[PDB]
Amino acid sequence: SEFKKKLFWRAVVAEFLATTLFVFISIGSALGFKYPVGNNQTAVQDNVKVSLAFGLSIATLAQSVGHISGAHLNPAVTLGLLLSCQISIFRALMYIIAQCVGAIVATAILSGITSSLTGNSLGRNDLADGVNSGQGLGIEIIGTLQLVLCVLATTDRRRRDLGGSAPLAIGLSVALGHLLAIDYTGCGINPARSFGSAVITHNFSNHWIFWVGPFIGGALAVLIYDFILAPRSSDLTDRVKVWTSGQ
Amino acid sequence: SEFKKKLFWRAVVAEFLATTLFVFISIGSALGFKYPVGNNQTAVQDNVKVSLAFGLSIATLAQSVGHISGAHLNPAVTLGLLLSCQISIFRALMYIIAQCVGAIVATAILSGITSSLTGNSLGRNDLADGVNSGQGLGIEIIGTLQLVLCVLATTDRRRRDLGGSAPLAIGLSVALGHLLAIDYTGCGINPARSFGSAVITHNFSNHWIFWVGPFIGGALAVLIYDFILAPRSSDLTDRVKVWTSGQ
Amino acid sequence: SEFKKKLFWRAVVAEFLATTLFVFISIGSALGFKYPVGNNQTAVQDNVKVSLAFGLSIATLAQSVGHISGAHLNPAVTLGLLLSCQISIFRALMYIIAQCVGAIVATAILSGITSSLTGNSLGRNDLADGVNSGQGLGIEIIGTLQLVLCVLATTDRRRRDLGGSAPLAIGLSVALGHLLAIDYTGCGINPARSFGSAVITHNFSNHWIFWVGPFIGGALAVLIYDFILAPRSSDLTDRVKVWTSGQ
Amino acid sequence: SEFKKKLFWRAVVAEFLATTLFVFISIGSALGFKYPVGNNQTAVQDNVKVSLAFGLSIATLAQSVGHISGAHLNPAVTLGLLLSCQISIFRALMYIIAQCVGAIVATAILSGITSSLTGNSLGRNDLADGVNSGQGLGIEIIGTLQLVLCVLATTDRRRRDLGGSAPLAIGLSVALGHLLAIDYTGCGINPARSFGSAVITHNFSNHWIFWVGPFIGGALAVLIYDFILAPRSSDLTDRVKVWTSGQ
Numbered sequence: 002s003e004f005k006k007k008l009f010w011r012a013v014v015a016e017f018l019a020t021t022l023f024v025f026i027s028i029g030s031a032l033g034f035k036y037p038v039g040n041n042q043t044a045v046q047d048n049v050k051v052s053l054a055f056g057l058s059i060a061t062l063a064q065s066v067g068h069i070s071g072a073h074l075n076p077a078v079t080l081g082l083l084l085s086c087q088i089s090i091f092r093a094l095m096y097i098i099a100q101c102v103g104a105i106v107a108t109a110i111l112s113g114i115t116s117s118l119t120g121n122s123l124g125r126n127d128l129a130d131g132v133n134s135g136q137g138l139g140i141e142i143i144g145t146l147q148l149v150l151c152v153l154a155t156t157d158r159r160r161r162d163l164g165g166s167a168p169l170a171i172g173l174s175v176a177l178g179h180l181l182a183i184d185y186t187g188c189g190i191n192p193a194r195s196f197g198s199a200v201i202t203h204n205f206s207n208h209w210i211f212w213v214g215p216f217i218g219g220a221l222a223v224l225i226y227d228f229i230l231a232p233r234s235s236d237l238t239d240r241v242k243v244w245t246s247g248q
Numbered sequence: 249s250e251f252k253k254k255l256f257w258r259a260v261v262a263e264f265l266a267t268t269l270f271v272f273i274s275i276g277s278a279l280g281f282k283y284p285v286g287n288n289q290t291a292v293q294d295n296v297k298v299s300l301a302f303g304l305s306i307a308t309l310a311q312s313v314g315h316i317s318g319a320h321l322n323p324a325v326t327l328g329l330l331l332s333c334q335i336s337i338f339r340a341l342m343y344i345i346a347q348c349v350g351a352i353v354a355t356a357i358l359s360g361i362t363s364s365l366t367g368n369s370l371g372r373n374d375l376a377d378g379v380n381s382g383q384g385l386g387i388e389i390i391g392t393l394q395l396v397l398c399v400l401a402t403t404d405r406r407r408r409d410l411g412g413s414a415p416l417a418i419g420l421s422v423a424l425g426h427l428l429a430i431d432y433t434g435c436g437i438n439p440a441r442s443f444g445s446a447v448i449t450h451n452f453s454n455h456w457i458f459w460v461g462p463f464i465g466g467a468l469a470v471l472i473y474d475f476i477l478a479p480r481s482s483d484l485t486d487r488v489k490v491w492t493s494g495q
Numbered sequence: 496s497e498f499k500k501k502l503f504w505r506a507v508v509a510e511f512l513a514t515t516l517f518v519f520i521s522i523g524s525a526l527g528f529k530y531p532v533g534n535n536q537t538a539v540q541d542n543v544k545v546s547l548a549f550g551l552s553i554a555t556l557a558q559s560v561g562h563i564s565g566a567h568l569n570p571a572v573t574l575g576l577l578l579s580c581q582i583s584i585f586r587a588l589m590y591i592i593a594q595c596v597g598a599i600v601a602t603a604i605l606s607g608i609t610s611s612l613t614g615n616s617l618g619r620n621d622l623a624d625g626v627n628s629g630q631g632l633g634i635e636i637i638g639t640l641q642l643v644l645c646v647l648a649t650t651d652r653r654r655r656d657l658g659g660s661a662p663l664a665i666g667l668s669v670a671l672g673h674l675l676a677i678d679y680t681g682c683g684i685n686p687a688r689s690f691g692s693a694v695i696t697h698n699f700s701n702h703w704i705f706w707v708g709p710f711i712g713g714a715l716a717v718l719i720y721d722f723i724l725a726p727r728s729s730d731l732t733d734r735v736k737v738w739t740s741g742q
Numbered sequence: 743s744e745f746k747k748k749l750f751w752r753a754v755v756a757e758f759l760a761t762t763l764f765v766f767i768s769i770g771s772a773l774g775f776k777y778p779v780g781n782n783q784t785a786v787q788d789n790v791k792v793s794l795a796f797g798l799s800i801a802t803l804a805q806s807v808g809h810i811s812g813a814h815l816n817p818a819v820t821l822g823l824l825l826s827c828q829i830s831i832f833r834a835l836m837y838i839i840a841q842c843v844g845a846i847v848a849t850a851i852l853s854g855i856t857s858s859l860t861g862n863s864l865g866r867n868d869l870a871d872g873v874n875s876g877q878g879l880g881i882e883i884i885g886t887l888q889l890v891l892c893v894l895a896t897t898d899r900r901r902r903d904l905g906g907s908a909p910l911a912i913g914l915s916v917a918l919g920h921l922l923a924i925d926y927t928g929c930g931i932n933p934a935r936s937f938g939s940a941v942i943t944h945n946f947s948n949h950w951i952f953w954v955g956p957f958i959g960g961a962l963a964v965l966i967y968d969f970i971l972a973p974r975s976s977d978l979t980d981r982v983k984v985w986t987s988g989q
């Protein structure tokens with residue numbers, strides 16, 4: 002069905018390119034504070050700068066490819082939309098693969114560009130001092146929960162009171178998550194974004210947190226928005242059939 | 249009437265969950281500047297970061313549950329909407345109870361997560377040096393007045409010139425209040441948000457300010473918007489009947 | 496005509512109250528960096544905080560009273576709308592008087608609240624070191640020019656491509672002007688806002704700049720938008736009659 | 743055709759004036775951190791302030807002259823719209839000339855205003871220490887690519903899901919590019935903006951990067967958005983005829 006449709010592959014390529022741009026721009030803005038290399042200054046990372054960079058990248062790329070691919074740009078958001086029965090399993094898998102490949106390519110290109118930084122971590126997400134696995138896991142769970150909840154509520158298609166720009170809302174949610182989690186874990190929040198940095202830097206220390214926590218948060222957000230707050234008056238079998246049909 | 253309706257209880261649970269997420273994310277972003285614990289640095293709290301975190305949390309959760317619960321997320325805003333005769337007394341009481349419980353739960357969860365911080369105040373609102381009870385009370389009154397005025401003017405339902413995103417407007421109002429009041433009192437502005445921190449930290453010093461001042465500001469905003477600027481051409485008895493009817 | 500209409504006086508009172516809230520909140524956020532008084536720290540004023548406070552105050556109060564008074568909140572913007580023949584002369588004079596009185600009241604209330612600050616200038620706009628009268632005058636002219644141009648283009652009523660929130664656009668224009676002019680002159684940009692601080696602090700040094708420059712910028716913006724970019728296909732006599740008719 | 747139309751010349755003058763205002767305000771906000779001159783402090787440039795100034799200037803001027811000139815304000819964006827066959831070659835050339843002249847005039851006026859700064863570079867874009875020609879070229883390419891992609895996707899005219907303010911989206915894209923590239927190259931991103939500073943400061947060191955990289959990024963964005971993601975079902979000859987017809 003969707004395997005032989007041109008629009009599906011265009012959406013996959015759009016997700017790949019937009020994830021590449023998002024990862025590259027956001028991590029490049031995150032690593033900007035270490036420049037100039039020659040100037041010896043005790044520069045402090047600005048959380049507002051990085052959070053706004055992530056949020057505006059999400060908003061801009063969502064405005065770019067919302068009508069083309071739905072503007073997922075996150076394996077956790079894609080998995081949440083799969084669990085809310087909006088996209089097919091094959092589409093979700095292709096989106097996750099494209100996002101991971103794009104993040105890896107973007108991180109490699111940035112590491113080539115930012116090769117002058119000694120000991121460059123390429124914005125790799127890791128636990129800060131004083132934060133163990135459980136606390137960072139909970140922070141990631143809450144951030145991805147609010148992000149997936151915002152995504153689900155924005156793309157409900159049953160609401161006539163919606164106003165403003167949906168890409169702006171998604172970007173502000175991402176920026177909120179970053180303002181929350183940068184000081185704690187660097188705000189992984191995106192399994193592809195952390196996975197690309199882990200692959201390029203050859204460091205997978207505490208990498209399971211940024212793949213499990215976002216998925217748990219997305220699943221909790223789906224459970225809440227679909228069975229507590231705004232239930233849908235449809236049979237479960239029909240929504241399960243969307244996984245094998247994609248419509 | 250509303251006691252036996254499923255939608256009312258779904259709205260109450262939505263208010264509870266959204267208040268939990270708001271309090272947790274906002275206070276976690278406020279306490280982020282103290283990390284890493286091992287690194288001994290004279291870190292300075294960024295007011296822009298905390299104000300944007302509060303505002304974007306308000307905007308995101310309002311976008312999430314506006315069609316479900318009305319997106320109050322504030323005992324002062326709920327009391328103002330009660331005094332403007334838009335919601336029933338029972339609904340207002342349930343919203344206040346849910347917001348307080350959610351704030352307490354969020355503060356407890358964050359204190360569990362942020363247990364590594366020595367002498368962690370959990371973002372407890374208190375008077376700064378040089379500010380007495382009256383000055384902080386006035387600052388809180390003005391901030392809650394502008395917030396409740398924005399909420400009332402946005403949800404007027406008689407205006408056809410409204411544009412953009414209403415959750416964005418509410419979030420920007422909250423961020424404005426925080427930019428005003430963080431340096432003075434930490435911008436309590438929300439009786440549930442301060443109440444949860446006071447309960448968890450077992451400190452109620454000058455806690456009456458953050459419960460009286462927001463209520464006074466909300467009442468003043470209701471009085472202004474309903475009897476000076478945009479009066480409603482309806483009898484007072486019919487609006488009083490909304491308290492016992494909820495319609 | 497308009498002297499005996501209730502809506503005109505409600506609009507005047509709305510302008511007064513919104514200008515009071517704007518001046519109070521914005522200057523209070525500007526003076527926040529000097530707290531705590533007891534703590535001896537070399538605190539540096541954050542231009543982003545003050546600019547965002549001014550912009551969000553403008554946006555929130557415009558969202559509050561746009562349908563009531565038109566949300567001028569600036570003697571320069573009011574004079575520009577008078578010169579673009581949208582409001583009457585009496586309405587413009589009443590708006591200017593109300594804005595000045597509200598700014599004076601707000602500055603007095605804040606000085607009462609911020610009395611603990613030694614040598615508190617109450618956010619009085621003055622020329623910085625290295626900037627003479629001409630340079631600050633030009634900066635104020637450009638800032639008010641872009642602000643009045645944005646106000647005129649937003650409230651054109653002939654454009655069907657308008658989107659988003661107009662109060663948000665006006666607030667972002669104000670924040671842009673502040674990001675431009677805070678380091679130079681403190682971004683007066685509003686004759687009432689500077690006038691209130693000058694009256695309360697009993698200091699009128701270089702105060703003519705903040706009353707002449709904004710007016711010149713507004714007049715230039717009106718001239719441009721009405722005779723170079725988007726001319727109106729109406730006789731000049733009919734537009735002059737709006738000054739004595741108000742319709 | 744368009745040479746004898748008044749609206750075309752009004753659009754050209756609007757582009758000139760808006761580019762002048764954009765360059766002047768943005769570079770003035772960028773150079774604000776060096777004041778006061780007499781006060782000897784180790785002031786650090788705030789990237790958030792400069793990025794927000796650029797973005798809000800773009801958004802405000804786009805809101806001002808979108809219905810008049812299309813709000814290009816960038817030779818790279820104008821070239822991208824020419825390559826996407828939306829504007830004529832003569833219109834693109836006139837827009838580029840007007841933008842360059844306006845940027846030169848704005849930089850000269852600001853240098854007159856900011857003459858008190860010793861060794862004032864007038865915000866001239868140059869490679870930072872540790873960044874060679876290739877890395878800065880790639881950063882500029884990516885920033886202009888995302889900017890032109892956002893511009894093309896926003897002004898598609900085939901999308902009915904668009905919401906919010908398009909000038910706000912363009913301004914947020916510009917602010918995102920600045921948050922990315924300020925630490926690396928100062929975020930040239932606009933050939934006119936860098937060209938004016940280079941002409942006024944009489945320094946063209948590494949100036950080819952800020953004229954080649956933005957053009958490459960715009961061309962890549964046009965290629966992507968027009969042949970990979972959202973192809974148009976029209977013959978190439980008809981779109982080529984727009985270059986000589988302008989319709």
Ligand SMILES: CC(C)CCC[C@@H](C)[C@H]1CC[C@H]2[C@@H]3CC=C4C[C@@H](O)CC[C@]4(C)[C@H]3CC[C@]12C
Binds near residue numbers: 110113116874876
């Ligand atoms: C992503 C695309 C569209 C734009 C960026 C690609 C180009 C400009 C980038 C990507 C990889 C980069 C190279 C990566 C590594 C190095 C080694 C270093 O010692 C000198 C610079 C050099 C040789 C870089 C030059 C610029 C470069 C070729």
Ligand SMILES: CC(C)CCC[C@@H](C)[C@H]1CC[C@H]2[C@@H]3CC=C4C[C@@H](O)CC[C@]4(C)[C@H]3CC[C@]12C
Binds near residue numbers: 140142361
């Ligand atoms: C709110 C939900 C959905 C997510 C967060 C819940 C989980 C991940 C949090 C909440 C309470 C947390 C615990 C609170 C206290 C402590 C004691 C400390 O010495 C080690 C960590 C530990 C044991 C935390 C581990 C993580 C934890 C269990």
Ligand SMILES: CC(C)CCC[C@@H](C)[C@H]1CC[C@H]2[C@@H]3CC=C4C[C@@H](O)CC[C@]4(C)[C@H]3CC[C@]12C
Binds near residue numbers: 380382386604607
């Ligand atoms: C504007 C309205 C709605 C709210 C603010 C008004 C009230 C709370 C403010 C305005 C003026 C203020 C007073 C101004 C001056 C002083 C003197 C000082 O040594 C102690 C505090 C005291 C006595 C302030 C107390 C609080 C105060 C009374």
Ligand SMILES: CC(C)CCC[C@@H](C)[C@H]1CC[C@H]2[C@@H]3CC=C4C[C@@H](O)CC[C@]4(C)[C@H]3CC[C@]12C
Binds near residue numbers: 632633636637851
């Ligand atoms: C762009 C327009 C609308 C507003 C700005 C124009 C005016 C106010 C500006 C532009 C050029 C400026 C002059 C440029 C250079 C100098 C030399 C210096 O030693 C004293 C100030 C002085 C004499 C400036 C005074 C103010 C000035 C005349």
